[PDB]
Amino acid sequence: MAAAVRQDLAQLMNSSGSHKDLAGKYRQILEKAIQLSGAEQLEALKAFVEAMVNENVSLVISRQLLTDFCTHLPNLPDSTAKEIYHFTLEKIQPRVISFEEQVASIRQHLASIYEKEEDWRNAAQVLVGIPLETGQKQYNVDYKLETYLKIARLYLEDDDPVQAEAYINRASLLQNESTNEQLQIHYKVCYARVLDYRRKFIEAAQRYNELSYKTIVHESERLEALKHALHCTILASAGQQRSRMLATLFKDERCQQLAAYGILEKMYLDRIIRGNQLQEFAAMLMPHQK
Amino acid sequence: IAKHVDSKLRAGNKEATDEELERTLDKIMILFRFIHGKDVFEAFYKKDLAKRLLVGKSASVDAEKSMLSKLKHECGAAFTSKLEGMFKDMELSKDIMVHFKQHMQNQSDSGPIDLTVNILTMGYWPTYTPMEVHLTPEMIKLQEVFKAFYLGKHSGRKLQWQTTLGHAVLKAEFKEGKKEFQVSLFQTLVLLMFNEGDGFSFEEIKMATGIEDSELRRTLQSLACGKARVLIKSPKGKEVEDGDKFIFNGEFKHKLFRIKINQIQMKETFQDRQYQIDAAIVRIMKMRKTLGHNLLVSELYNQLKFPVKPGDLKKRIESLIDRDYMERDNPNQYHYVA
Amino acid sequence: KKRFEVKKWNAVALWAWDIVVDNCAICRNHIMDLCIECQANQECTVAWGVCNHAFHFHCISRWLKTRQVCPLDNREWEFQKY
Amino acid sequence: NVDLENQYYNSKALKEDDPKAALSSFQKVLELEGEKGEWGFKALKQMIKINFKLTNFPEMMNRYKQLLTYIRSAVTRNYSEKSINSILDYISTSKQMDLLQEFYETTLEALKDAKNDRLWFKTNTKLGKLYLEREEYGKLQKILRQLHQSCQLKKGTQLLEIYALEIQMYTAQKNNKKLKALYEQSLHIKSAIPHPLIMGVIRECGGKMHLREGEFEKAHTDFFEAFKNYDESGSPRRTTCLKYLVLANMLMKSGINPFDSQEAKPYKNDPEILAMTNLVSAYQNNDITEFEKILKTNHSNIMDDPFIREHIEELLRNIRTQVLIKLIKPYTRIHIPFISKELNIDVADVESLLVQCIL
Ligand SMILES: [Zn+2]
Ligand SMILES: [Zn+2]
Ligand SMILES: [Zn+2]
């Protein structure tokens, strides 16, 4: 029943000895407060968050306390962690400039929770709140690319192709110059998925075919990409580019193991396909392709 | 050579003059019109204009735009380019500051500090990223308020602040006499963060303020040394190491009620490519005999892999047309002429 | 009472575009993916201008082949950067 | 002598006793100083502001006279112009136009006594703008004539400013021919460094005149220049300029989305521009049904000004012509009622459109 200890924090503010003593007192009071488990603990964290934003405490000590509190923080049940995450996110709003980077980290953690809570709607909104571009503090290229790819994937899983396309365009605006290797492959995968979702089937098939020749990617994912390219080029609008792509896939010996080889045979030679033939081909199509 | 006209255009109190200043400016242009190598003069004048307008104020914008207009003649509208942009940026900064003052006086009129912004354009000015130093909480409110106001006025612009090219005034309260300081951002931050507490070590300054080590060393080089009375220290000249115990003396007997320690401004610290371009120009010709200038530039850009700047294109075209390799009646077309 | 208090503060800032370029006005495709005909035919990069509009290179050359006018601002097109 | 200049600071520091003590303190600031310098300029001003705060017009009038004879030399032209503009604005914020008029008259006469130059030019320009605020024409016209005589080339800024003022007056006086003549005259100046507000003002009128006459390429160029120069200077006219640019682009046969430019993309979601954005997106990628739906839904917000309504007849006909051309392309002998069904118009309109297209 150590509820009053948070009020003791006020008595820490009266000290005028501006040195490591205040940092140690804050660290030890945080250590004492985190030992609780009930709603008293939730009130404790709350009070701590609403006291950290106070202007009386110096910027450096408050920043250090906030950052180590966040870095040790998330070891609680998910519900209380989400509640306190929302509380601190809405509380640090008046002083975002002085508490920028910390807030960013917190937001990322919140998105992580929505990754395991099966919520692709609010996860994108939470990840958007991070000021990647605006702000006196700028991040590296890799962080921006990873955040944009995560947002694009999250929006894609929510059946919102417009926002996914916008954020993949934002990512590609800076993807050209980068040092990471797997990030380029992930960006190509996300762009191909976005093009597939936007019903640009021939471009998606071209991107998937180009992706299938990559050596870093695993063989199983290569076969999956080839299957996706075949499905996209079968659904693509009839024409000359589609026929050229069909010939290109036909000249590949890996199409035999694919389940849609017969349709490829009947389409490459320009033969009319009966209605009953596509009875089983439409079963393997993606839900958004029907 | 442009240093003379920069000093003549600089603010100098008694240097203030009359229409004969315009006559002397015309005389300077008379000496300039027959001088070759205009690129160096233009670059030096751009640097001088940036120095005069970005930090501090010049003698008068009158003669400034008069000189810009005079250089527009005999050179071309596209040749001047940037300087007109700097002038327009200064005008926009003045207008935006007036509007922000009106807005601040209108709603929640408190005015803790007097902000003065000088918003510039990314391209024209010789910009440079700041140290990303953490600003003390007294000036964060005005930064947020002006950012909100600018976003409300202009949509989708984003402000890229520079905390290395500004000034401020601090009302010192050491003892009797409010010695109004005039400091740069680094010194403002150091003094303000030292205000809460006493005797912070150099590593404490690095942690609390976040200035880069070299810039912080340069800043703490001042506030002492000169006149050996701003701060009394046993070492002289330069001696600063990690863990140094330094504290401002609790008295300031500087014998003038106008303190300016922002003295940092005073104590401030192809042949192969040209051959390839000429060969490309020749190869584009002896084929397309009559060709436009933009078409020729695009053709050379297509035929080359490395980027190359358009200035190289223009200078090589001029050099090789000087050698009677082409001839110039449209002014944007070239015949082969061998 | 503050030993140092800020009375006035003159700061120098900059403005930019939070989103510079997304599509070529000519081909309506992405700026940095491919120049539409380059996709059907099969590196080529963007070509800026004095007005800083940054079309493609094949697209701007095709436009210049007919008329020497910038598509958007309708000014004289002078090449800059590559 | 550092005491003399810095004692203004410690006399402005004991500014708690403004009445009968600040006046005396700055009075002895003047009397203890003989060197013509900026510090006396600061003194005058300070007491001018303090005195005008506590009424007492004649003393501040005399202090005006002292300041105006102080503007001859010593202080920089930039600071003197800034102080004159600041004092004029800080009084004009309280109206009381008669003492403002004597203010402007004294500035004009004093700057006539000294060199006039751009300082007197801009003082008279500000007086003309103040007259324009009242929309009265006689005083504005006479001030404009005085200004034009003073101007009457290496000084194109002055001509551009006076032409902008003339265009601003005549756009309220409703004189189309005068506006066209003034725009044609101002087209000659090519070596000026003006404020972007002036450039936008002189370009918007030219774009409107081109739109009225029938030209569309020059109208589009002028409207783009006006919008670009109106954005920067803040301005609350950027919108209508963007709407006019969109309309001119649509009347240009377009083929290129005007919202793909970096200078107009952020405004594509403005509440006053959304209807025009939808109209443009419907125009290209021909869709008559979507165009009609947008026109009917937004029939009360954009169908008010007499500039889009009069050009809506040119539209709804180019789009129909393009749809007809793209529809009759693969056929060789096509029924006319089929075309009427496709275009959602009666047979007579289809026949008239076909006859006009063939002719
Ligand atoms: Zn393009
Ligand atoms: Zn290409
Ligand atoms: Zn352009």
From Swiss-Prot, chain A:
Localization per record: Cytoplasm; Nucleus; Cytoplasmic vesicle, Secretory vesicle, Synaptic vesicle
CC per GO annotation: cell junction; COP9 signalosome; cytoplasm; cytosol; nuclear speck; nucleoplasm; nucleus; synaptic vesicle
Chain positions with N6-acetyllysine modification: 25
GO biological process terms held by the UniProt record: protein deneddylation; protein neddylation; regulation of protein neddylation
Keywords: Acetylation, Cytoplasm, Cytoplasmic vesicle, Nucleus, Signalosome, Synapse
Domain of life: Eukaryota
Modification N-acetylalanine occurs at: 2
GO MF assignments: deNEDDylase activity
Annotated family: Belongs to the CSN4 family.
Subunit structure: Component of the CSN complex, composed of COPS1/GPS1, COPS2, COPS3, COPS4, COPS5, COPS6, COPS7 (COPS7A or COPS7B), COPS8 and COPS9 isoform 1. In the complex, it probably interacts directly with COPS1, COPS2, COPS3, COPS5, COPS6, COPS7 (COPS7A or COPS7B) and COPS8. Interacts with TOR1A; the interaction is direct and associates TOR1A and SNAPIN with the CSN complex. Interacts with STON2; controls STON2 neddylation levels. Interacts with ERCC6.
Protein name: COP9 signalosome complex subunit 4
UniProt organism field: Homo sapiens
Gene designation per UniProt: COPS4
Shown chain mapped onto the complete sequence: 1 to 290 of 406
UniProtKB/Swiss-Prot annotation, chain B:
Taxonomy, superkingdom: Eukaryota
Post-translational modification: Neddylated; required for activity of cullin-RING-based E3 ubiquitin-protein ligase complexes. Deneddylated via its interaction with the COP9 signalosome (CSN) complex. (Microbial infection) Deneddylated by Epstein-Barr virus BPLF1 leading to a S-phase-like environment that is required for efficient replication of the viral genome.
SS bond partners: none
Transmembrane segments: none
Domain Cullin neddylation stretches: 272-330
Signal peptide: none
Positions bearing the Glycyl lysine isopeptide (Lys-Gly) (interchain with G-Cter in NEDD8) cross-link: 286
Family according to the record: Belongs to the cullin family.
Assembly description: Can self-associate. Component of multiple DCX (DDB1-CUL4-X-box) E3 ubiquitin-protein ligase complexes that seem to consist of DDB1, CUL4A or CUL4B, RBX1 and a variable substrate recognition component which seems to belong to a protein family described as DCAF (Ddb1- and Cul4-associated factor) or CDW (CUL4-DDB1-associated WD40-repeat) proteins. (Microbial infection) Interacts with Epstein-Barr virus BPLF1.
Name this polypeptide is given: Cullin-4A
Whole-protein residues included: 409 to 759 of 759
UniProtKB/Swiss-Prot annotation, chain C:
Recorded superkingdom: Eukaryota
EC number assigned by the record: 2.3.2.27, 2.3.2.32
SS bonds (residue pairs): none
Zinc finger (RING-type): 35-74
Keyword Cell membrane carried by entry: no
Enzymatic class: transferase
Ligand binding (Zn(2+) 3): 51, 53, 70, 73
Binding locations of Zn(2+) 2: 35, 38, 44, 58
Compartment(s) of residence: Cytoplasm; Nucleus
Domain statement: The RING-type zinc finger domain is essential for ubiquitin ligase activity. It coordinates an additional third zinc ion.
Name the UniProt record assigns to this protein: E3 ubiquitin-protein ligase RBX1
Source organism (scientific name): Homo sapiens
Gene that encodes it: RBX1
Full-protein interval shown: 19 to 106 of 108
From Swiss-Prot, chain D:
Compartments in which it is found: Cytoplasm; Nucleus
Gene Ontology biological process: inner cell mass cell proliferation; negative regulation of transcription by RNA polymerase II; neuron differentiation; protein deneddylation; protein neddylation; protein phosphorylation; regulation of protein neddylation; signal transduction
Residue stretches making up the PCI domain: 219-359
Post-translational modification: Phosphorylated by CK2 and PKD kinases.
Signal sequence coordinates: none
Cellular component GO terms held in the UniProt record: COP9 signalosome; cytoplasm; cytosol; nucleoplasm; nucleus
GO molecular function: transcription corepressor activity
Keywords, sorted A to Z: Cytoplasm, Nucleus, Phosphoprotein, Signalosome
Record region (Mediates interaction with NIF3L1): 1-240
Quaternary data: Component of the CSN complex, composed of COPS1/GPS1, COPS2, COPS3, COPS4, COPS5, COPS6, COPS7 (COPS7A or COPS7B), COPS8 and COPS9 isoform 1. In the complex, it probably interacts directly with COPS1, COPS4, COPS5, COPS6 and COPS7 (COPS7A or COPS7B). Specifically interacts with the ligand binding domain of the thyroid receptor (TR). Does not require the presence of thyroid hormone for its interaction. Interacts with CUL1 and CUL2. Interacts with IRF8/ICSBP1 and with nuclear receptors NR2F1 and NR0B1. Interacts with NIF3L1.
Family: Belongs to the CSN2 family.
Protein name, entry field: COP9 signalosome complex subunit 2
Organism: Homo sapiens
Protein's gene: COPS2
Interval of the full protein contained in this chain: 29 to 394 of 443
